[PDB]
């Protein structure tokens, strides 16, 4: 869960390499996108859509191993100064109608780095953020320019727990390089139901192991030597995906002059083809 | 006005037969002239050193009057010169402007293209950013695919071992001293070897 | 404009001096767009270097894509090196190859055009590094 | 994020003809021979 990254790598959500820390536990890859305007004027509330796609259909094995639905999560890194718009600056449907969850700062202060703790279902394959751009005028520590924005979107349960242990939402390979003879898949009782195993590999050391509930089995007795590999299934159906982008904090001031200049240029050119070429009659006389 | 007035009258030399895409040559050149200026301008605030390299760049962006602009142009005009030079190659090619009378203008040409790509390659790494610092990291070994002289090459371009700051030191010399003098030499030949035309009639 | 005595492989028919008076138009036109694009797409300031962390994109500028898409494609070696070297050197030889039509221009010559177009396709195709495995694409 | 260049490209091509047009059109309203 997003809350997990915060507690695990509290200082920053992304490794020096650029890969976000989610991939440590959600080792399955799937798409991810960040949609922000090329540029926004300073102090403007605008949209930022974090798409975490995947066709509603298909179920993942839940803790109990029964097929269930999909829940989404993410981590968004806006550039310095940006932070969500104050509840009152968020237009009606415009920004307020689209997406409504809770954006928790990775750590006290960082209002430009939000975890989307809330883990919506098939309702939020979209997830919209109403962010407010900084003002380099009221903040001399903020400047205009093009800056980077990062994303780490998720969906589907993790294959590893912050506890260090793995979920049943992945594979439990074998312990020995050898042929198993049976499936010790009995139930249990009450608040639990394991599906043990009876590996052989009798070759000197005749070992067996334990597989949890949820992941299906494929092969067993008669063969399945391998080398303590592939249990017999990987119910993993979802994963992490990143996407980066950039937005320009534009100074309408910069634009004016560049538009002003452009007009002087076009104008300055007009006079050229006008006077120069078109007033070529002189020798055009002889 | 005499004192060597004897040549002066050598001016409005001679005309054109059929053109327009025939402007690519000067465009590419223009993009260069734009680079020389804005590039130079940055040598007043850029520091070729691992420690101060990255910082000076931000310094140019937010501190110098228009630094953000001089740099922004340099970045674009660069990608434009190359883009334009390619188009110029098209113009020229598709029109057999290399045929016979003029093939040396074309070779000095290919040369100019290697000098031009080199510019971008060295300059791309100067902001000592990851993209520029890892792009140089990656292209450094490329030449090591050769015997004794395949690694001597690499050792000479990077500074020795792997990618130190000598890499940045040599890359800056190359980008602001060497390469500029070469292009000037070959743009010099390329232009002088010109008293040319092509494909026309009666 | 054009009669008989200045004979050879070069020529000047009509428009002397003052074309070099639309040039300024071109120059201004070039600058303006670069300047315009410079304010519209300001130089993005990137993150600092670190020899320990590497991955997650890195591509060589761009015009180096075709060459890059090559170098990384075929198993290192020098075939790549030798291959990319073939781009500039291979060109230097062209005015020697497609140069058998001195009595006639090599532009209608398909065994040039076809080849040219073709090669500028490969070039493109190679441009677009393209995700390694599926860097298949056309 | 392709759709940002996809429209960015269409514009370069077209504009050429738009400019070309006004050029022709310009000459025409003054004499093109």
């Amino acid at each position: 869960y997003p809350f997990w990254a915060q507690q695990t790598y509290p200082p920053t959500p992304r490794e020096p390499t650029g890969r976000i820390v989610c991939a440590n536990c959600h080792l399955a890859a799937k798409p991810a996108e960040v949609e922000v305007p090329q540029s926004v004027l300073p102090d403007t509330v605008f949209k930022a859509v974090v798409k975490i796609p995947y066709d509603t259909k298909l179920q993942q094995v839940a803790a109990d191993g029964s097929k269930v639905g999909l829940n989404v999560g993410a981590v968004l890194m806006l550039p310095e100064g940006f932070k969500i718009a104050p509840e009152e600056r968020i237009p009606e449907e415009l920004k307020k109608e689209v997406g409504d969850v809770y954006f928790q700062p990775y750590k006290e202060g960082q209002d430009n780095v939000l975890l989307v703790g809330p883990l919506p279902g098939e309702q939020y394959q979209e997830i919209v953020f109403p962010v407010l751009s900084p003002n380099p005028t009221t903040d001399k520590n903020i400047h205009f320019g093009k800056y980077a924005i990062h994303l780490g979107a998720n969906r589907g349960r993790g294959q590893i727990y912050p506890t260090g242990e793995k979920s049943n939402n992945n594979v439990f390979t074998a312990s020995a390089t050898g042929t198993i003879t049976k499936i010790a898949k009995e139930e249990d009782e009450y608040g639990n139901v394991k599906y043990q195993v009876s590996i052989q590999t009798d070759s000197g050391k005749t070992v067996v192991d334990t597989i949890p509930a949820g992941p299906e089995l494929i092969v067993s007795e008669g063969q399945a030597v391998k080398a303590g590999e592939a249990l017999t299934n990987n119910p993993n159906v979802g994963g992490f995906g990143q996407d980066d982008t950039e937005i320009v904090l534009q100074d309408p001031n910069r634009v004016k002059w560049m538009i002003a200049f452009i007009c002087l240029v076009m104008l300055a050119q007009l006079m050229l083809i006008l006077k120069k070429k078109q007033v070529e009659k002189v020798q055009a006389a002889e | 006005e005499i004192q060597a007035l004897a040549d002066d009258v050598t001016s409005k030399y001679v005309p054109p037969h059929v053109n327009i895409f025939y402007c690519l040559g000067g465009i590419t050149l223009t993009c260069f002239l734009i680079q020389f200026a804005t590039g130079f301008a940055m040598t007043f605030y850029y520091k070729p050193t691992v420690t101060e390299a990255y910082a000076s760049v931000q310094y140019i962006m937010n501190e110098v009057s228009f630094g953000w602009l001089i740099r922004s142009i340099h970045r674009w005009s660069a990608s434009m010169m190359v883009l334009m030079m390619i188009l110029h190659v098209f113009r020229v090619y598709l029109t057999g402007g290399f045929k016979k009378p003029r093939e040396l203008t074309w070779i000095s040409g290919v040369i100019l293209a290697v000098i031009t790509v080199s510019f971008g390659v060295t300059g791309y790494s100067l902001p000592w950013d990851q993209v520029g610092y890892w792009a140089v990291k990656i292209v450094s070994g490329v030449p090591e695919a050769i015997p004794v002289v395949g690694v001597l090459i690499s050792d000479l371009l990077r500074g020795g071992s792997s990618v130190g700051q000598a890499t940045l030191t040599r890359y800056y010399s190359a980008h602001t001293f060497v390469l500029p003098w070469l292009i000037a030499v070959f743009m010099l030949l390329h232009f002088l070897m010109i008293r040319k035309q092509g494909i026309s009639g009666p | 404009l054009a009669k008989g005595m200045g004979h050879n492989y070069y020529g000047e028919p009509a428009w002397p001096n003052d074309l070099l008076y639309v040039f300024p138009v071109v120059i201004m036109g070039t600058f303006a767009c670069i300047v315009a694009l410079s304010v519209l797409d300001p130089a993005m300031v990137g993150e600092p270097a670190n020899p320990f962390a590497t991955p997650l994109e890195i591509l060589p500028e761009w015009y180096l894509y075709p060459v890059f898409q090559i170098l990384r494609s075929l198993p290192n070696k020098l075939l790549g090196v030798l291959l990319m070297a073939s781009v500039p050197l291979g060109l230097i030889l062209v005015p020697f190859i497609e140069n058998v039509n001195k009595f006639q221009n090599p532009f209608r010559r398909p065994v040039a055009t076809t080849i040219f177009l073709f090669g500028t396709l490969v070039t493109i195709w190679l441009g677009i590094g393209a995700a390694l495995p599926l860097d298949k694409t056309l | 994020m392709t759709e940002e260049m996809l429209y960015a490209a269409l514009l370069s091509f077209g504009l050429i003809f738009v400019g070309w047009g006004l050029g022709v059109l310009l000459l025409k309203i003054q004499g093109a021979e």
Binding site: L41, V265, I273 | - | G29, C33, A36, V39, L40 | L15, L27
Partner: peptide, 23 residues
């Protein structure tokens, strides 16, 4: 808004060319 103009200024400034074009 103002940004709209800006590009309408780049796309609109390509006019530079529209001048040689008058050849």
């Amino acid at each position: 808004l103002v940004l709209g103009l800006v590009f309408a200024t780049l796309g609109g400034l390509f006019y530079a060319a529209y001048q040689q074009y008058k050849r």
